[PDB]
Amino acid sequence: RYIPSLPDRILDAPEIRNDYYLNLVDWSSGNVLAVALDNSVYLWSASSGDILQLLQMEQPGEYISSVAWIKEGNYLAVGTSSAEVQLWDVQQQKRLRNMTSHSARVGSLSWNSYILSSGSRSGHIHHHDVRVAEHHVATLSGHSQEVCGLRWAPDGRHLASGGNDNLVNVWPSAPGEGGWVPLQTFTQHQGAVKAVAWCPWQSNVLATGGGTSDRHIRIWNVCSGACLSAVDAHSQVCSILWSPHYKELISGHGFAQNQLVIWKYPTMAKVAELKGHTSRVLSLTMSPDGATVASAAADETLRLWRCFELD
């Protein structure tokens, strides 16, 4: 199939933090990209090109460490270096909450309806019920180093977390009568696991990717614990996304090519490589229609690739 070798757009990302563990971009269901540039968050409306500086941190030294849109796209969660999880209403352009519970920077976030899960450099994961005063409703402690990857499954039955301790944990949706204990703990990656993504059409299928010392994409069945595939990408794997229409996966990489790789699922055959970034890719996010992937890189650019469409 025809995949364009050039991106559809190249947006300037001056002052983007070249820190592997941070999750600095997210594309809303309302077709708005949120991009964290140092101490500010900018919003770019894909349909009009309008840009808004939503917020800026108020104290010296503070920087944005994560962003994540709620499913409806009206609220943006913003994790900070000062261990806060802020909740912004982007229609009103105002901060609704400043949730403190963490002891260190909040580098990862994932929503499950009104529950927002936040992962910290401390190794802990907190569940926040953003609708209520006592927001901190659970603590999940299965990592000894920074939680850099965090993703609820689309059906809300599992939460996956990846850490700088080379572990992947698969958590249940509720503690039940027991405690918050992982259903699965995968130790096979030999490097940090920032890339965590669930298969949109298969409830229990998860893809994870490891850092420079690992370089592999692994596919798992979280019910059986099976590792269905382990593929060497020859570079750190910062992010993985699944196409919800083509039965393909896309991954972002660093040294030496700083490319995105498209893979055919389930064969894991390499379909294409998107080249152009001149420094390592930091994060990927996908448009709500599934057609475009935005890659944020250390070269201070956001490249938007229309790699899953012909129109």
Binding site: R9, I10, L11, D12, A13, P14, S40, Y42, W44, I51
Partner: peptide, 6 residues
């Protein structure tokens, strides 16, 4: 350098 500009 305007942020997010083309």
């Amino acid at each position: 350098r305007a942020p997010x500009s083309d």
